[PDB]
Amino acid sequence: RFWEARSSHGRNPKFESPEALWAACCEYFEWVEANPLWEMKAFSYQGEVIQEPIAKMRAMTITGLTLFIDVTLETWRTYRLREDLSEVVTRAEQVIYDQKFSGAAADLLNANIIARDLGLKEQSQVEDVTPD
Amino acid sequence: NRFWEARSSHGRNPKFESPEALWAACCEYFEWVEANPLWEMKAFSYQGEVIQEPIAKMRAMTITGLTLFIDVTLETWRTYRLREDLSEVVTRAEQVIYDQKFSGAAADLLNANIIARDLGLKEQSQVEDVTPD
Amino acid sequence: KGNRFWEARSSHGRNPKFESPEALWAACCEYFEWVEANPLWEMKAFSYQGEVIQEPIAKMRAMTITGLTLFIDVTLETWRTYRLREDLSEVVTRAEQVIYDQKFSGAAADLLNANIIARDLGLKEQSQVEDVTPD
Amino acid sequence: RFWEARSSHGRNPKFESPEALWAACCEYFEWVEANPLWEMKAFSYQGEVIQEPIAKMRAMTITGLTLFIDVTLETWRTYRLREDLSEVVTRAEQVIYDQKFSGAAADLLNANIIARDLGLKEQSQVEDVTPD
Amino acid sequence: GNRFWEARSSHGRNPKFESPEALWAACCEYFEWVEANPLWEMKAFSYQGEVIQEPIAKMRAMTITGLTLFIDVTLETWRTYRLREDLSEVVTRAEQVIYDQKFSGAAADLLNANIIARDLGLKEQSQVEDVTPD
Amino acid sequence: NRFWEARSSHGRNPKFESPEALWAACCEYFEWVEANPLWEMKAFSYQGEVIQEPIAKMRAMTITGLTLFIDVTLETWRTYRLREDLSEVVTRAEQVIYDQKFSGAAADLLNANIIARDLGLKEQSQVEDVTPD
Amino acid sequence: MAAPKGNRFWEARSSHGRNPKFESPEALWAACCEYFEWVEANPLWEMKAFSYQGEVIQEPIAKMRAMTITGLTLFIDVTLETWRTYRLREDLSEVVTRAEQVIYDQKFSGAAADLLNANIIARDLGLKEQSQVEDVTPD
Amino acid sequence: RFWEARSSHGRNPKFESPEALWAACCEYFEWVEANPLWEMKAFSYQGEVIQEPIAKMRAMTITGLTLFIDVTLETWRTYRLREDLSEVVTRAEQVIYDQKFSGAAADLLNANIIARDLGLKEQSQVEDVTPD
Amino acid sequence: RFWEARSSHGRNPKFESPEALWAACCEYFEWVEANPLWEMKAFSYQGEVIQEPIAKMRAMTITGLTLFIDVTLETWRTYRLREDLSEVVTRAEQVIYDQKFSGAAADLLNANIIARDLGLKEQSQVEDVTPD
């Protein structure tokens, strides 16, 4: 139940400090690390089937973070305002980006879904070789 | 997989007036999804006999799924946008639905391409014409 | 166990005259039940000590608007008729949502072929292309 | 041999009623289900190889139907012109379409071959984001 | 000889076909030869430190070129059959059999789907919307 | 294997002047190909011991391979098409080569896309611009 | 000595501590090397399952961690602005160029060896697909 | 060490004879076949892990040949000036082409990279079916 | 620590002969061969896990080469143009190209990554077959 997870800062927290905001974000990173998604795998030994869960990496997201610390995207975007907090926001979003990038690069996360999410572009060069 | 029968405790044609009640209803849908995986039949053999076992697959959350479950029309759901308390709940619920599918596809628990299309994740490209003449 | 789907008809019989949303929903639900009770079957082989054994394994049957209408024995023209009366069009919208959702969740779980289903549902690939040709 | 299979209605059949034509079509459908194609697979045990035929779904086709009931495509097409048979042709062609769609959707027939045969379209949206 | 380029019907060298039955009979000989002559994929197995090898049969795709080659008529002569209707119906029938053999084989993944799709001329259909603002 | 050393019984730089002589040489190539598969090394283990064994793989026939084998240049072979007495043999040999590769690719014994390009099998598509107006 | 150390990447920092002020190429390059070593010493981990006699065993398998310029700056604890500022002195600019080249090569070599996802890395490095198209419409 | 391999004609040889030039090319072909690349493959049993190198086909290349016979690509191109040597160059490049084509067709070499190297083209026909 | 590897030619060498430069390039080639990358492979026996490192081919790059011999890319391009060094640069780059091509062809290196790096192009022929 990922939608139930909330930081220790409680309901509708007010952040008037970088240290406090960053710590709440770190609680989210910690929760993601501690709460992988589960893939049910089936095994069998001599006529008996045993179904055991296998951990899969959970991709970090900004909506996941904000839901966790119990604020709206709009409030999160409000933090961008004060430089004090804006620095924390930048760092948290970079962590989210790098988690997904490193996960995808290590084939722990689906590469194309992450490439699309991160906005990694395909670059190409096309030559028209039609004789004139 | 009798999903078309599933309904929240709020029953038929509920009139939501409270954001906590609407959110609780949405949470009932999320709980239902988690408790009701789709099933893949898998077969194994041993000493001359074949054994079949259903294996749990993640069920993708959808807005139409949610609304059917809490028994409102998509039109009713859009009405909630018209007042701030309910609209905040709609946004929260839609973000949960998006993230469930994104994280599921990212972990290859859901088919990545179909989820990418559903979520509107775009392919971005840069193309140079090297024969501009 | 036989895939004679061309023989499957609802209990409502030939050419139902639905005058009721409860009635029409009821008919739609009979179709959904048949689909789930009637998976496709795939033969899988297993070896053991010099002998191979075959076992059929259930595969999800995709719902379709065509299937539903054929099953309840109304024409597509009749199905679109229901739209005329906002009474039945509400039941039609609900059925089509169920059919869409069945195939979407099936495909998402890889129980149905994702590309077949993406084309069927009309899920689009979206792209953004920048021309970076110098100038 | 699939080119040898024929309905109980004999050579160059004439169809006097929709029930007769439908009966012949259903014979084709039933023949298809009773005659899967076979993938040959090998298994090994203690030095010997076993060749195990494994059943693969046979896709229905209109030309297969017409070969089976022993009429040309041209003749089949004339049945649309009979007021007593037209609805049967429609029904038969719809069964053929549905069998392939359901089979492909269930991963029992090759998805791309069926998608092309059925005319299932890919839809896309493209935005030119070149700065002006 | 029994290699594919050597295989021939029981009508022999350069048969001049002037009947539907004789022609259809010849075509069936080809269809039967194709079924009797799958291609072979070698597979290896290990047992107690000795490797063992045996092949599995792979479906041979039917082709119009293969058929004409087998019944020993040129493609030119085959086209000629199109002109007279006696033969024309047999030609159409045979070509439908060839098409369906490959189509069903590919649908069952017993033949390579993309090779067959290109051969049969099965088309990809698409719809594209330019959503560039303006 | 030294495939570049394989040569028909017609010797060095033969000067073909008969269609039966050219066809016989082409047939020696066809047989050589069918008789000389490529070989892939595969590993096998048993209770902690490993053994390797070559497994036979289909060799694709090619016009360049044919000409190398009968020992004429590719350009000489192209010349044969203009020759009244040799042209039919060229056409026939090129058909055998095409047919072998087609059957191999269709049977998944040769790489499908490499063969599709080699044979010139085309992809056909139909595209509708559905941009509203 | 062959299991997850559990070092959280967002916590990782060089021995130079908080907000270091790099005033020599040597100090800077040493810090960059700490990052390169950290990446090597802290792979990502994939959980894999095994079984023997009806018991399910979990075990982590190491997966290569891709180096990134953002990763480096976070590790040595300077902002992107500061990193870009290093370009002002020919002194530090050489270190920056070399560090970025190391990062590029680590990813390329990882991807080429199938240790990192090829397409993810190709997009990251800006490796282009080049094509030549002939219009053969009878004209 | 492939960059150290050299023909028996020594350093920067001068080829005057077509037979000498062909003989050198054949030394290269022989060297390629005697020097496959190796893939390490791991096997395990009862707690022990064993590694085994497996031979992989080495793709012939014109640059590889010229490095081996120790001439520059420029020198190689210069051979075209003499009808004599030009025939040997064509024969050699033809052997190189076929080795890679046949290896790729048999999936002993990566087919798409070989397709690009050989310049095998994708041919398509595209119909604009937009209604008017 | 590949970022610490350096040729016997020391820091920021100023090369004055083709033999010296070629010698330095060969040290790099030798280093690459002696320094494969490692994939951890896991096996299980009796509820215990065995980890085994497996060698993976390291791709040669001009960037790796210049880092190893400790010169800038512009220095390297300067060698391209130097009458006395240009031949050696061509030779070194040809070695690097062929190592990656052969590795990719053998599937020992990722084919698409290498294809992009080598600049191998996809060639196509397109007919527009629209009616009118």
From Swiss-Prot, chain E:
GO terms for molecular function: DNA binding; identical protein binding. Homononamer; forms a ring-like structure through which genomic DNA is translocated into the capsid. Interacts with the terminase small subunit; the active complex is composed of dimer of terminase large subunits and a nonamer ring of terminase small subunits. The keyword DNA-binding applies. This is Terminase, small subunit. GO terms for cellular component: viral terminase complex; viral terminase, small subunit. The N-terminus contains a helix-turn-helix (HTH) doamin that is involved in viral DNA binding. The gene is 3. The keyword Iron does not apply. The terminase small subunit binds to the packaging initiation site and regulates the ATPase activity of the terminase large subunit. The terminase lies at a unique vertex of the procapsid and is composed of two subunits, a small terminase subunit involved in viral DNA recognition (packaging 'pac' sequence), and a large terminase subunit possessing endonucleolytic and ATPase activities. Both terminase subunits heterooligomerize and are docked on the portal protein to form the packaging machine. The chain holds residues 6 to 139 of 162 of the full protein. Residues 2-22 are annotated as: Helix-turn-helix (HTH). It comes from Salmonella phage P22. Keywords: DNA-binding, Late protein, Viral genome packaging, Viral release from host cell. Belongs to the P22likvirus small terminase family.
Curated annotation (Swiss-Prot), chain G:
This is Terminase, small subunit. GO terms for molecular function: DNA binding; identical protein binding. The N-terminus contains a helix-turn-helix (HTH) doamin that is involved in viral DNA binding. Keywords: DNA-binding, Late protein, Viral genome packaging, Viral release from host cell. Homononamer; forms a ring-like structure through which genomic DNA is translocated into the capsid. Interacts with the terminase small subunit; the active complex is composed of dimer of terminase large subunits and a nonamer ring of terminase small subunits. Belongs to the P22likvirus small terminase family. The gene is 3. Residues 7-27 are annotated as: Helix-turn-helix (HTH). Pfam families: GP3_package (PF16677). It comes from Salmonella phage P22 (Bacteriophage P22). The terminase small subunit binds to the packaging initiation site and regulates the ATPase activity of the terminase large subunit. The terminase lies at a unique vertex of the procapsid and is composed of two subunits, a small terminase subunit involved in viral DNA recognition (packaging 'pac' sequence), and a large terminase subunit possessing endonucleolytic and ATPase activities. Both terminase subunits heterooligomerize and are docked on the portal protein to form the packaging machine. Disulfide bonds: none annotated. One of its GO terms (cellular component) is viral terminase, small subunit.
